Design a binder for this molecule. Structure first.
Ligand SMILES: *[C@@H]1O[C@H](CO)[C@@H](O[C@@H]2O[C@H](CO)[C@@H](O[C@@H]3O[C@H](CO)[C@@H](O)[C@H](O[C@H]4O[C@H](CO)[C@@H](O)[C@H](O)[C@@H]4O)[C@@H]3O)[C@H](O)[C@H]2NC(C)=O)[C@H](O)[C@H]1NC(C)=O
Ligand SMILES: *[C@@H]1O[C@H](CO)[C@@H](O[C@@H]2O[C@H](CO)[C@@H](O[C@@H]3O[C@H](CO)[C@@H](O)[C@H](O)[C@@H]3O)[C@H](O)[C@H]2NC(C)=O)[C@H](O)[C@H]1NC(C)=O
Ligand SMILES: *[C@@H]1O[C@H](CO)[C@@H](O[C@@H]2O[C@H](CO)[C@@H](O[C@@H]3O[C@H](CO)[C@@H](O)[C@H](O)[C@@H]3O)[C@H](O)[C@H]2NC(C)=O)[C@H](O)[C@H]1NC(C)=O
Ligand SMILES: *[C@@H]1O[C@H](CO)[C@@H](O[C@@H]2O[C@H](CO)[C@@H](O)[C@H](O)[C@H]2NC(C)=O)[C@H](O)[C@H]1NC(C)=O
Ligand SMILES: *[C@@H]1O[C@H](CO)[C@@H](O[C@@H]2O[C@H](CO)[C@@H](O)[C@H](O)[C@H]2NC(C)=O)[C@H](O)[C@H]1NC(C)=O
Ligand SMILES: *[C@@H]1O[C@H](CO)[C@@H](O)[C@H](O)[C@H]1NC(C)=O
Ligand SMILES: *[C@]12O[C@H]1[C@H](CO)[C@H](O)[C@H](O)[C@H]2O
Ligand SMILES: *[C@]12O[C@H]1[C@H](CO)[C@H](O)[C@H](O)[C@H]2O
Lengths: 392, 390
């Protein structure tokens, strides 16, 4: 989408995976979808270093809405959970230096059963623009055939444009297309700043594996269409929650950087370990994700429960990820000719290799003819940065 | 097995899950199956508080054997990897006040392809006894019939007894039978100090869940036969490795305690987090696992992606574990009438409840009329101890 936005993958926080559709503010107030939750998340994004690290968008997912539209046909914030309305939350979020994302659905109802945009594409787009909304996530539930899905996604895109406000547009067009026919990524890219391809993540290693395996299986179809203004969206970062071991968390961060994924944390910023925080705020891995070249990486090799992924970076640098998919035993040795990495460019005539994950370690100069030898934890990833050099 | 051993479930360390069949001492001397690995783990069991917490058996699994028996038909330690031999390793382990476990297979080979014990049960038993072995784990691979399987496990049982040496006998008889016919657990217990029921654990939450699901499904057949001298073995603790989140590690420790499971760590004691160490050394939770009554706990309830398990303890105490099996979202609220716990006796007329996991916290006095409310982490467990007020 040529709206001048998302020149790098969008970074922020989204409530869905962690907080879901919790409407019970009486018995579950700390986890219910309320203005107070977003106000508190906003403060902590500023004070706990998240905005500094690049996480800029505070995003509302499903279950912010009143059950019905107002008399004047507009969407309304839930009066009990959002009594001060979207406009004033937008003011609060802007006052902290952050941008505000909101959520709607192309079809008749949102996935959670709240008012769809089946008509109203134009008034809804305008409502968001009046409110101060800086990002829209547009889910695809309750949609009447391919024709409407496509038409709806294309309509809301132009509608947001016609508001003349800068609004990052986040689509699930491809994901809700698969059931009928293969997506057309060139068309989707025209209309959308990023697009969900695959089933909602949850707080599990199984979910990470299934997203990586779908991505690598399908990589010839999706890798090249990604670039500034249009990204593949493999769903939210779930680091800092309950389901992933330290190693599986390193794997998600490493490979979301390889895939030029948007980085939407879905966690509780009020209750997050120092380890998870340091990983999500790792300047060097964020720098790989945010690389201005904006070329998505890919899986180079698979075999013996090992995966090798790499991503081209600006200035003849490469990121390399080595995954151990063996879920038994100890750290496994993996060796590769440095020549085989970065299409033989990265280390011609030399590489300087820095390990970034699981810890940051200068490894030194590798000749084009060198071997790289590493040890990789089960369900973990080693992430390397290769800097092309004349020296040595 | 009435040999006076395993009166509480056996505690220690077993190489298999973390170190497996690593024979590469040239390229990997610090993780190959060698007497140096076992000596290192022994020193740390003493120096790092493992022994003091009750971890007492340092156990060798598969891949310790030379490829061939000796000229006298006996098993031999690999001459390169176990150069001083098993007896001498046993001497060392004993000098630190620990016990040594070793491994054999009821069939013609071990699962990894080394010499099997079929036809050598009596000599193999005497060999182990002579060496000063304090425990045998007896795997079930390369056994052509259920007759040979049963005969082999019983025969080794009687041969161990006849050596005169106190040797804990860990069997896999039910595991290898189950595909073909329902095991008789009354018979297995007469011959075995503990018995593997289910597929080898690995370093995953999938493995944990599948072991718990198998145990809850089969609980009518296995819970009542467990007790001092004979335990269900749901396989090794993998806490301190790579594959489990903190909440999944808590779930393993909590439910191995509810299940009166043997506690065999398979980890690297040289490289283990403070968190993993304090969970595995948690004295209140080990006291539940090690309760002298020896009554295995069971699944009370399952619904809304929650499980409630409980175990009766010495002195009118109960352990209760509440699992959140929902792998999405945040800490979920669960409430149960305390009258529904411990068969109606735990909290009649009242009980004092202490949370043990994920943190120790006194919750206070609960009346027979009361409801316990808890928030449980996705893939996590809340473990409570109930003390009846009388
Ligand atoms: C509604 O849709 C229209 C139709 O596309 C859209 O207009 C386009 O906006 C983009 C973004 O501003 C324009 O692209 C820019 O063009 C100008 C002029 O050539 C350049 O200054 C811009 O350069 C930036 O990006 C460069 C990297 O590519 C940087 O090097 C540089 O520093 C600049 O930051 C950029 O190329 C595009 O020209 C228009 N196209 C048309 C047909 O007008 C409009 O923005 C949409 N409006 C909203 C609010 O959605
Ligand atoms: C070989 O098999 C026999 C028979 O099963 C085992 O005998 C049993 O041994 C236990 C433990 O020594 C006896 O019970 C215990 O006795 C001791 C001392 O008297 C007491 O302190 C305990 O409280 C408990 O009562 C058990 O009764 C006995 N059974 C029989 C029939 O004699 C023997 O231990 C086995 N030997 C080896 C080397 O495994
Ligand atoms: C370990 O290996 C030996 C040798 O391969 C096994 O011994 C063999 O066991 C088979 C049973 O599977 C015997 O075959 C039987 O032969 C009779 C007729 O003789 C036939 O009627 C049966 O139906 C069956 O086919 C075979 O005779 C026997 N061979 C020897 C040398 O004893 C042994 O059983 C293996 N042990 C285990 C536990 O797997
Ligand atoms: C997939 O979508 C792309 C973009 O809509 C299609 O390519 C364009 O099709 C339009 C309308 O037919 C042409 O006017 C353009 O010249 C085409 N290219 C571009 C880059 O805009 C493409 O035909 C669609 N279908 C397939 C099978 O690729
Ligand atoms: C399961 O195995 C047990 C023990 O081998 C069997 O129980 C024995 O039954 C015999 C009768 O054949 C009695 O002599 C013994 O007193 C019992 N032993 C014990 C300690 O109970 C039982 O028969 C087997 N059950 C089935 C269903 O086959
Ligand atoms: C919404 O429902 C109406 C019928 O009430 C139907 O005509 C329309 O196709 C539906 N719209 C979408 C986008 O599914
Ligand atoms: C749409 O299953 C829905 C849900 C909201 O109800 C989330 O937004 C999810 O990410 C999306 O795929
Ligand atoms: C038998 O798969 C084997 C293996 C040794 O080779 C381990 O001892 C495992 O625990 C056991 O079931």
């Amino acid at each position: 989408l040529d709206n001048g936005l998302a020149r790098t993958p969008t970074m922020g926080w989204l409530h869905w995976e962690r907080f879901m559709c919790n409407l019970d503010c009486q018995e579950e107030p700390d986890s219910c979808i309320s203005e107070k939750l977003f106000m508190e998340m906003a403060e902590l994004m500023v004070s706990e270093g998240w905005k500094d690290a690049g996480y800029e968008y505070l995003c509302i997912d499903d279950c912010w809405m009143a059950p019905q539209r107002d008399s004047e046909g507009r969407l309304q914030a839930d009066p009990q959970r959002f009594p001060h309305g979207i406009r004033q939350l937008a003011n609060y979020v802007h006052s902290k230096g952050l941008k505000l994302g909101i959520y709607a659905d192309v079809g008749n109802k949102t996935c959670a059963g709240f008012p769809g945009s089946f008509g109203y594409y134009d008034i809804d787009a305008q409502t968001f623009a009046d409110w101060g909304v800086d990002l829209l996530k547009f889910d695809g539930c309750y949609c009447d055939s391919l024709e409407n899905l496509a038409d709806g996604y294309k309509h809301m895109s132009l509608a947001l444009n016609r508001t003349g406000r800068s609004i990052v547009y986040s689509c699930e067009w491809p994901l809700y297309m698969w059931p009928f026919q293969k997506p057309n990524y060139t068309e989707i890219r025209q209309y959308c700043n990023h697009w969900r391809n695959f089933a909602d993540i949850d707080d599990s290693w199984k979910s990470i594996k299934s997203i990586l395996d779908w991505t690598s299986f399908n990589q010839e179809r999706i890798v090249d269409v990604a670039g500034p203004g249009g990204w593949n969206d493999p769903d939210m970062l779930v680091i800092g929650n309950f389901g992933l071991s330290w190693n599986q968390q390193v794997t998600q961060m490493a490979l979301w950087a390889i895939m030029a994924a948007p980085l939407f944390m879905s966690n509780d910023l009020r209750h997050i370990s120092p380890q998870a925080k340091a990983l999500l705020q790792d300047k060097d891995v964020i720098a790989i994700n945010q690389d201005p070249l904006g070329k998505q990486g890919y899986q180079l090799r698979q075999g013996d429960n090992f995966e090798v992924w790499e991503r081209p970076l600006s200035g003849l640098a490469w990121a390399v990820a080595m995954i151990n998919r063996q879920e038994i035993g100890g750290p496994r040795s993996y060796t590769i000719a440095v020549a085989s990495l970065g299409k033989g460019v990265a280390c011609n005539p030399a590489c300087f290799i820095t390990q970034l994950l699981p810890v940051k370690r200068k490894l030194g100069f590798y000749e084009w003819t060198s071997r790289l030898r590493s040890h990789i934890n089960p369900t973990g990833t080693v992430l390397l940065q290769l800097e092309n050099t004349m020296q040595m």
